[PDB]
């Protein structure tokens, strides 16, 4: 309760430190996050997202990410505090770690149930996340990639909402230009979750020239174990439903 | 696909011992990397959770493994200590190599490759006091790979020829051998469970093999002075009439046997049977009844009027059976129609071929009925008598091998008395009346005469 009361103080540094302490506390067990929630911290934390402070928004979004990462009910009640589209606007700030915090928060929100994913889609956040990923480079794209992958893996309507929102070419860009291993592993995982649904999924994925990239990447010795595993998983989930012969044709000889 | 070293080191490659969310890339550079990257983000004025993005939030990484969607339950699946191994590798990889993997496997239990070739690495996997490995196809072994360590050994789905290659290289430690779905044979392999090999045997799991004398196994236990967990229910050796009370009684070791709750009276009734077991008919001795005939085609309903010179009738109903010699056959139950018939046979078999007895009990043993109708002019005239029949069923009898006193099973060979023909069977006698006014099945019972008290088990003097 004292940490919650410390935020009500007008000191920006005190707010930042209290949010950092809350994030550090609610990242080890769901009961810590629940106890922080029961002190009324959700209502406050949503009220400083609009605050134009870099570090304050960073710490608030980090605490929200750490809270909404444990259980379904926590992530559900977090969205109940009207966190949209105030969080979605944070993907356009000049700051980068704020964008990473927002991507991580969204990723933790819509990983439990398709209802939260559906609410995010209806709030118009998938396009914003895709644009923020395309406008940024590095590990910042990873939370958004795992987000969109979880959303696609949730249900069929969510995968359609992602595909119509131009998610596949962004994933191809992630797989191509990012030199890091876990980023392209996550891109392969998201593409595989996209293409594991109806043949229209693997259709929309196959036009973007990702399958030859995945095949070459899983046929690359310098690749990591998890990356090759996820690339093979994506290939198996996409080629099991893809109905386009001219793109499955090159897979014959390679 | 595999040599043991190459398969272990391959699966150690299958478990990604250098890579995400375990292991190494960028993300490490202030969490799962060495110190400069970490510390200089402090000692240079704080590069914050701003992390340059050479790093992740590690709680996010852990949240990926914890995620109810990102795969990593084991991977999503198997032997749980392997997930701990991944969890260490998240926590920090850098230090870890084959050096640590060699340290890790105090047991090895990470099932299935279809592989079989034993080699050197097991020694290098320093700690291994246990194996539990399965769906691998091993036949006999580079025994030598035994580090001076091994206690417990499950081997489900291996194929092994004899114990001997391994047992002729024994660490004085083996608490257990187990070989489910396997094949091994006889009373004599008990020698490889002697004190030369394995004085330490506390535990056993030996089904699907074929092992054949409880007192040969007592020779092993007279030299493996340790037993407390067991599988003898599931081997041909259980077939001796006195087995439950004898096995409990036999030697200073097995404190409890087979499934049972004492809390009533049992234990006062039952200690003392192995003494009697020096005297009992020590082999296995089975009394075996055949069952009463059903689906009895009233082949006379086809003449529901039946009394005239062909139509008119007398019947046989018999089984012909497989029982192990694989196999010996008799035409057992033979006797005529009544709309339901009563028919029985009993054999007693005294048996020693316990591998094939176990094969007869487990495998699918083969059984048939024969019906005969008579349809006669006073000449009744009879075709054989007449034949009109079904007889085939595949049949199963494990409880005797589970050391239980009795099996029953009931076998339908298939329809000749259909329900319309059954209604009509009563209609043959009802059409004899109107004029005058399971589908083809047997029961089976197979006793291996076992018992309910120490004194009643003494009756196998007589077996």
Question: Please, could you describe this protein's structure?
Answer:
This is part of a larger assembly, with chains A (254 residues) and B (463 residues). Chain A starts with a helix and ends with a helix. The longest helix of chain A has 15 residues, at 181-195. Helices cover 70% and strands 0% of the residues of chain A. Chain A contains 18 helices and no strands. Chain A has helices spanning 2-8, 12-25, 30-38, 41-47, 54-67, 72-79, 97-109, 114-122, 126-134, 141-154, 156-164, 168-177, 181-195, 199-206, 211-218, 225-239, 245-248, 250-253. Chain B is of the alpha/beta class. Chain B is built from 14 helices and 14 strands. In chain B, the strands form 5 sheets. A 4-stranded antiparallel sheet of chain B has the order 10-8-14-13, with no helix packed on it. Chain B is elongated and about 115 Å long. Chain A: ARM repeats lie at residues 1-27, 30-69, 72-111, 156-196.
Question: What is the string of SSEs of chain A from the N terminus onward?
Answer: HHHHHHHHHHHHHHHHHH
Biggest chain pair contact, residues each?
A: A-B, 33 and 32 residues
Task: Characterize the quaternary organization of these chains.
Answer: part of a larger assembly
- Main sheet: strands, sense, barrel of chain A: none
**Total number of helices of chain B:** 14
What is the CA–CA distance across the termini of chain B? 53 Å
Fraction in helix of chain B: 10-25%
Measured as a percent range, the helix fraction of chain A is 55-70%
Largest sheet of chain B: 4 strands, antiparallel
Radius of gyration of chain A: 19 Å
PDB class: protein transport
Keywords: microtubules, axoneme, sperm, filament, protein transport
Entry title: In situ structure of the central apparatus in mouse sperm axoneme.
Chain A: Sperm-associated antigen 6
């Amino acid at each position: 309760p004292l940490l919650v009361l410390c935020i009500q103080e007008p000191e920006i540094a005190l707010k930042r430190i209290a949010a950092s302490a809350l994030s550090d506390i609610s990242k080890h067990s769901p009961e810590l996050a629940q106890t922080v929630v029961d002190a009324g911290a959700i209502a406050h934390l949503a009220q400083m997202i609009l605050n134009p402070d870099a570090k304050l928004k960073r710490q608030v979004l980090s605490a929200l990410s750490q809270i909404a990462k444990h259980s379904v009910d926590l992530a559900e009640m977090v969205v109940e505090a009207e966190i949209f589209p105030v969080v979605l606007t944070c993907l356009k700030d000049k700051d980068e770690y704020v964008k990473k915090n927002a991507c991580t928060l969204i990723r933790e929100i819509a990983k439990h149930t398709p209802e939260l994913s559906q609410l995010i889609v209806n709030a118009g956040g998938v396009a914003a996340v895709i644009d923020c990923i395309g406008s940024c480079k590095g590990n910042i794209r990873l939370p958004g990639i795992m987000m969109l992958g979880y959303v696609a893996a949730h249900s069929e309507n969510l995968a359609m909402a992602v595909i119509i929102s131009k998610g596949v070419p962004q994933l191809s860009i992630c797989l191509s230009e990012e030199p890091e291993d876990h980023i392209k592993a996550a891109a392969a995982w998201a593409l595989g979750q996209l293409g594991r649904h109806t043949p229209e999924h693997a259709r929309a994925v196959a036009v973007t020239n990702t399958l030859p990239v995945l095949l070459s990447l899983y046929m690359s010795p310098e690749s990591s174990e998890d990356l090759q595993l996820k690339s093979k998983k994506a290939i198996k989930n996409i080629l099991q439903k893809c109905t386009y012969l001219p793109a499955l044709e090159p897979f014959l000889y390679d | 696909p595999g040599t043991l070293s190459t398969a272990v080191c391959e699966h150690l490659r299958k478990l990604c011992l250098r890579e995400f969310p375990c292991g190494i890339g960028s993300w490490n550079k202030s969490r799962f990397l060495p110190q400069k990257c970490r510390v200089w983000r402090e000692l240079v004025p704080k590069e914050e959770e701003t992390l340059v993005p050479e790093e992740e939030t590690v709680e996010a990484l852990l949240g990926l493994v914890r995620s109810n969607h990102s795969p990593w339950a084991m991977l999503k699946d198997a032997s749980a200590e392997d997930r701990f191994l991944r969890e260490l590798a998240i926590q920090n990889p850098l230090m870890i190599k084959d050096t640590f993997f060699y340290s890790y496997f105090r047991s090895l239990r990470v099932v299935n490759k279809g592989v079989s070739l034993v080699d050197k690495d097991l020694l290098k996997f320093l700690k291994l006091e246990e194996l539990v490995l399965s769906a691998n196809k091993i036949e006999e072994i580079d025994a030598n790979n035994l580090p001076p360590t091994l206690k417990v050994l499950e081997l489900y789905g291996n194929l092994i020829a004899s114990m001997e290659c391994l047992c002729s290289a024994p660490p004085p430690r083996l608490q257990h051998l187990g070989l489910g779905h396997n094949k091994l044979l006889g009373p004599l392999e008990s020698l490889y469970v002697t004190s030369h090999n394995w004085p330490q045997l506390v535990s056993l799991d030996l089904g699907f093999n074929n092992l054949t004398d409880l007192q040969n196994m007592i020779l092993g236990l007279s030299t493996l002075r340790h037993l407390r967990l067991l599988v003898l229910q599931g081997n041909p050796l259980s077939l001796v009439p006195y087995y439950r009370g004898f096995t409990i009684d036999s030697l200073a070791h097995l404190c409890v046997l087979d499934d049972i709750t004492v809390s009533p009276n049992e234990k006062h009734q039952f200690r003392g049977l192995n003494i009697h077991g020096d005297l009992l008919a020590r082999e296995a001795q089975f009394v075996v009844t055949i069952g009463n005939v059903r689906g009895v085609l009233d082949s006379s309903i086809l003449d529901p009027e039946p009394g005239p010179d062909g139509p008119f009738i007398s019947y046989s109903y018999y089984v012909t059976y497989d029982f192990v010699e694989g196999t010996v056959l008799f035409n057992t139950v033979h006797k005529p129609w009544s709309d339901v018939i009563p028919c029985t046979y009993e054999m007693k078999h005294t048996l020693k071929e316990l591998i094939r007895v176990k094969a007869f009990l487990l495998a699918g043993t083969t059984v048939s009925i024969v019906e005969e109708k008579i349809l006669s002019w006073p000449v009744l005239r009879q075709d054989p008598p007449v034949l009109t029949v079904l007889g085939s069923g595949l049949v199963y009898l494990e409880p005797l091998l589970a050391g239980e006193a009795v099996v029953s099973t009931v076998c339908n060979f298939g329809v000749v008395r259909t329900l319309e023909t059954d209604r009509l069977t009563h209609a043959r006698d009802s059409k004899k009346v109107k004029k005058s006014l399971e589908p083809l099945s047997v029961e089976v019972q197979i006793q291996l005469h076992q018992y309910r008290s120490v004194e009643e088990a003494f009756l196998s003097l007589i077996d």
